[PDB]
Design a protein around this ligand. Structure first.
Ligand code: FBP
Ligand code: FBP
Lengths: 411, 411, 411, 411
């Protein structure tokens, strides 16, 4: 009795916003991945922060290895309603991942937390960490990992594990070439999610042992979790027990955005008729730096004609004139002149599309300025020559790609 | 030299948000007029507050006679980003109008301001008051009134004046039946705007003289301004000298929203191709309770068909499905199911329109829930019976009106 | 499991900050009692708000029936850390005590809380309401009252009750002339504390029944609690189960400041060697509007001599020169010139004491300006003539008394 | 007319809070110099920020070039009250001196500011920059430098200049070995203050051109100001025209805190009877992150004896018992047990002094824990052996020094 409320108070979160995502070729060149925009007005890291608040954890330690400017500006601007007088703060702790928490160890000790929540903030999900902690304490563990079945065809990109009846870790392997399958199913492999919970005093004792190691890669998956697994102190936490989902019949939603295609497919999943991820949830609202923007102004074309939309999102500040829109997502302050045709696109902020454009299966970067008459996504080899094109068919367009093409982005 | 900066630092604004917007019949029944929504995401009072900030005046005294909760929430949330050890504050001073500033006289003195800016916050405009204070000091005046020519056909609703070559007040009359016309034009009458500037020590001396008067109506226009005009200490300030207009060639924008038709016509003026009021202007921005809303989600109808829009605004949180929209303004969190036809409407927040509705020249009040099949604006006598209809043709729709009609509005 | 964390989120607090504080004769005439300053920089209402935060309840509804100006200022400055996404917000709901709640019923329905916490914010205490909600739900109750034993000699000022073995309410009487004593002790009477917890749907159903009552006093103690007691649905919650106290051996701290002597005695209780109330708690802190003040500047007198202090408090901004201080509490921006002798005093903010004063058992009101040579607390009849003096011996000094006396306070 | 109001709105500040602080050898090893505490609760950088607000510049760009966490935490907590819609914010732009402002050129342009104010935020002063901008535009300069006469015995640590009758720069030299004296006085040298004002367009071209130089040190003083001086476009701005000072007869206050002695002597200047720097100025106040702390609690010693103070400061949260204090400055949450004797010290926050200590001419670092019986400042050779001792006589004590001495600071 009186445990669920108490446990978040004694813990602190360590978002590992390292922004690698090397598959996002040029999208993360000038910004860490956690600060990638997603679903209108949000960043990715808000999904990690908002799950910390709504789960009760109001002490959060961001660890931006990249030392990025936009992430700092976002945390500073949006997540700046906290006062340390009440023991609620977002701490920016600039610097393998595991070593990165060792340099800021002397600060983390000053929090004097009993437990800690390691998070990878370059993911999209909803989870109630308090429900995870309860499962950590009831088992009397030292390390609680968030496990989730995934297809074996991509299990090589995560850490795979094998558990007993009591969710105790028996075997663990980090990024195997031939992932072991679950015993009751060959087509899937129980995978880690980059969400760990540690009892603090064990971690501090453990990291120093790793800091002195001359061979450790200083990574959680490759160095520490196998060591704890050898020690027999690690336990698992099936993610569906904690996944916040309106429909209990639906599957858990955890989207690794590691590549471009999944970024596009995940942003458009919002625009569909029945989204898998519900932002309208009022019991788990997601927060962000919400700048003041005028309403989404649709207008008539130069010819006085109307504009069509079909299964699309339109943020604040946008401006659209005529210009058939389909299956697309328009971020803030976008401008779309007349006679355009946009189909299954993702337009990041402050874009300015000219007249008579035609876009199909594209991802436009921030503040690009497409010229008049540009056509994208209809001829593969042409688009591959000008811009980057993935094997799936998706196209990416950044300021530099156009800059080299001779168009002007000064505006 | 160094004067324009020093002057706003010695002055404080007094917004008279009494909001006795009687001609707004039922729209202001449950809320003070300043807290009326206008333009998508804005109240009316922000126009008075934002002009005080952008003119440098960061001490503002809101004088909410009505003692509303919504206005106090708006000020508390949206406009309470201040630090008071730096002498910048929005202050709520609850209680004719002259007497409204006399009860809080003891509180006002403590600011120790040399000048004061009287404002009526139930109007819409943009003005740089530092440009007014400069014209106040250069003239060595004690009262500076903001004068603006207006059509004589409606000059009876304002205070009329007659000035000399030096903008000194010669004759003043408050709300005449036969307004005198300007000398150089019969069709117009130089009118007051409800914007006054007083040298502080004079005002305090003057109001006490009025408070002891057993016959004064305790109102600025009917009691004090005639007294100062008799004293020959009042001077005028033509509003074009201070009107912040993006397009210099255009005429100054001052909309008295006193009646319903002007509210509708002013909100739709935004939606036009070339708005008279530019809120996109970044050299004179306007603030508000910028709440967080998911993007404007357009979708397909039940039949999988598309949706059209034409010269319209769409706030955040809205949801539209098919449903042809024209010339309309949709405030936040509005839901519009399929087969609708909306034409020159103004839909305040949280409305829920059912299927197969048809709206024309209407104003929906907050959080109404229209039932399925409703038709508005096509038959005058029917709409006059069910709802309130103005002589111009405009229609007003309130929660109570439909409650009386029998459609349950609990949601 | 997992019910403790979700109990606060589903509830909302209703601070009844409308106390007349009639027993405090002139201290609270110009300010509502909750806004009375206490123990340095804090007000009284912060103890109610800070217990709501630290118990998890982040939705708070203030009610300000009488002299609602300073309180609004404080709430809008100190407690304007609004984050409407996650439904954590301090709300201002201006208008017997129940009557005040009913008028704002339609708003309270908009919070969609399962439970509600009624509080009297004109008291001083520390409590963890989540530990009350747990005791409310485990008993399966509908009304949970916070009970505390008190001396029978003053039990007439509170509501007395008599309970069975299971903390169920058997008998209840509001403010009796002859308080019934507890059965196991004649010298005490189990009393209410003005802290109630109601399951929301029961309250809304219940208040309308009371609103239609033509004879009810519209007060919680005299009308509703006897009704629920007759229904046999009220249960008690002994406060020691929830009192936050560093030393478990000490008694619970609940100070009704209802009279002047208790206000003085409570403020000086801080200054003692071992305070009964501990503000130095990292685990359970108390917030307030903390303006940037310079540090407490002690200096030399006109004669170059030193200043002594003994068991005293000194806020920020203060300035003490020489001037022996004892057992006293100095609020912010106090100024104390030389040759003074202060013994067991309570000096509210911005006081300016002149030279060669001598104060003993006094309470100075905000922003008074004592003249040179004034002597207080040494001759009873003289002090009774000039100022207000209580039967215990304490003296109160407001600006008005001095203004009448002839020492101007314009400074 | 209307110029001084309009000028700050078009300008932006660039705080160069990247100082290595080599001269403060141990104080700033773990923190940037701007984050050094000063005068109770303040940080040095607040003097530059508060001068930007109170001079009207509400766009400020901090440049935390290295070893900065504390600074980010201070800005993020205390100084983040972003408007962001009115165009007022505190940016953080992490990275010679000119390289720091070159790398963030892309971000800075985005402001579209006509003028810019280069500042060195590792100084203490009060200045109204709008008076500087007025003096900048009236002269038609492209670079305005803040000039101040200083003693020639230390002019070698600053940039020296020589001007004509119209404050135009004739000769300039950055950190000379033999400083030239002013013509009308040999004992002084007109020196730069690290406060520059540039017309924005000229600055970007100037910086871009500087970037390509393979021999420039990328510093303002050594590279750019000589180049502009050669061009004859640089003008001076005598600091007394802009120095904010209560007493006009006093000298201008600009304290370079470059060494430890000046840090001590400047903090103790506050504690004197008549401070040179006035924090008690309502018309020109200075902000800071002000955590809510309880009042300064003085108490009795173990023997029940009293405590003396003489020309001292005591912040909030402090606790003092007996323990004669003289000429000293006690920062927040200080603890001082009995029988202590403190004379002309500077105790940074969270210090814990044991019993029977004796301190003289010392500077204690944040969060030290002095042991019982320690004596400092009475035997020079002993203190030089244990801690750092300056040539002037001042002593610096930090945690690391104590840690090596065998004491334990784990508390
Ligand atoms: O006669 P006055 O000038 O109104 O003074 C009465 C006193 O009451 C107060 O308004 C009380 O203020 P607060 O309760 O808001 O602290 C003082 O500021 C004021 O000096
Ligand atoms: O880092 P050390 O050697 O443990 O010393 C610790 C102390 O120094 C500090 O880092 C000083 O930091 P600041 O200068 O940022 O206030 C404190 O955070 C801490 O209490």
């Amino acid at each position: 009795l009186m445990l669920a409320r108490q446990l978040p108070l004694k813990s602190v979160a360590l978002i590992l916003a390292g922004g690698r995502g090397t598959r996002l070729k040029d999208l993360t060149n000038k910004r860490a991945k956690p600060a990638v925009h997603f679903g209108g007005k949000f960043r990715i890291i808000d999904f990690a922060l908002s799950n910390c608040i709504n789960s009760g954890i109001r002490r959060m330690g961001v660890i931006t290895q990249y030392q990025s400017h936009t992430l700092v500006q976002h945390i500073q601007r949006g997540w700046s309603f906290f006062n340390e007088e009440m023991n609620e703060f977002v701490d920016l702790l600039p610097a393998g991942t595991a070593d990165a928490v060792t340099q800021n160890l002397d600060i983390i000790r000053r929090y004097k937390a009993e437990y800690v929540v390691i998070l990878a903030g370059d993911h999209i999900y909803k989870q109630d960490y308090s429900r995870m902690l309860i499962d950590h304490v009831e088992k009397g563990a030292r390390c609680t990992v968030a496990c989730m079945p995934v297809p074996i065809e991509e299990a090589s990109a995560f850490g795979v594990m094998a558990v007993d009846e009591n969710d105790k870790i028996i075997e663990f392997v980090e990024k195997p070439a031939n992932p072991p399958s679950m015993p009751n199913d060959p087509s899937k492999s129980l995978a880690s999610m980059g969400i760990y919970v540690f009892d603090a005093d064990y971690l501090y004792e453990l990291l120093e042992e790793d800091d002195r190691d001359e061979n450790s890669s200083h990574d959680f998956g490759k160095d520490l979790i196998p060591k704890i697994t050898e020690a027999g102190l690690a336990y698992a936490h099936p993610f569906p027990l904690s996944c916040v989902q309106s429909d209990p019949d639906a599957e858990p939603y955890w989207r690794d955005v590691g590549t471009l295609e999944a970024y596009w497919k995940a942003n458009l999943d919002l625009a569909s008729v029945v989204p898998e991820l519900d932002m309208y949830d009022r019991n788990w609202p997601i927060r962000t730096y919400n700048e003041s923007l005028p309403p989404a102004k649709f207008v008539q074309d130069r010819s006085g004609s109307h504009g069509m939309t079909l299964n699309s999102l339109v943020s604040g500040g946008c401006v659209i004139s005529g210009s058939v829109v389909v299956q697309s997502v328009l971020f803030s302050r976008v401008r779309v002149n007349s006679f355009c045709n946009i189909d299954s696109a993702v337009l990041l902020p402050e874009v300015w599309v000219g007249r008579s454009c035609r876009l199909r299966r594209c991802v436009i970067d921030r503040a690009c300025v497409i010229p008049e008459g540009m056509v994208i996504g209809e001829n593969a080899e042409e688009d591959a020559r000008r811009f980057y094109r993935s094997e799936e068919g998706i196209v990416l367009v950044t300021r530099e790609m156009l800059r080299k093409l001779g168009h002007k982005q000064e505006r």
